[PDB]
């Protein structure tokens, strides 16, 4: 099936894209939640 | 029906891969 | 597979270029 071959090629390409997204998502969320937790706990210490 | 089945499978694959990011980000955000 | 590979590369390029704006704006916004 030509569609089967296209989908199988897409599966391999998708793993590259989701690997890229994950490596960026981790670092970005580590920074935003850390500045959110920082501002929150400083104000709680008050 | 072959191109419909494989094109639909591509759409579901895309939703599944990205939804994993969306859920992780949302849960962690509301968790803090 | 050539048109699939280059069309997919175009999608990833577009995500990468715009995501740089999104991350910068979001970080600076929550920073203040």
């Amino acid at each position: 099936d030509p569609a089967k071959a296209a989908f199988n090629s897409l599966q391999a390409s998708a793993t590259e894209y989701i690997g890229y997204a994950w490596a960026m998502v981790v670092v970005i969320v580590g920074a935003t939640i850390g500045i959110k937790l920082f501002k929150k706990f400083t104000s709680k210490a008050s | 029906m072959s191109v419909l089945v494989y094109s639909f499978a591509s759409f579901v694959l895309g939703w599944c891969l990205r939804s994993g990011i969306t859920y992780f980000t949302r849960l962690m955000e509301t968790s803090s | 597979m050539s048109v699939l590979v280059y069309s997919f590369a175009s999608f990833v390029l577009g995500w990468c270029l715009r995501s740089g704006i999104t991350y910068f704006t979001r970080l600076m916004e929550t920073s203040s």
């Binding site: 030509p2 569609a3 296209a6 989908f7 090629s9 897409l10 998708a14 | 191109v3 494989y6 094109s7 639909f8 591509s10 759409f11 579901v12 694959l13 895309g14 939703w15 599944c16 891969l17 990205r18 939804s19 990011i21 969306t22 949302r26 | 597979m1 048109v3 699939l4 069309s7 997919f8 999608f11 995500w15």
Partner: peptide, 29 residues
């Protein structure tokens, strides 16, 4: 070039568009 050429190219374009629409749909919180 040939009908088969157009057919195969169109199918590959379709799956890569459906994946992109899938990412946009999945990224809606």
């Amino acid at each position: 070039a040939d009908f088969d050429t157009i057919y195969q190219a169109m199918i590959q374009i379709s799956v890569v568009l459906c994946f992109a629409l899938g990412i946009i749909a999945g990224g809606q919180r």
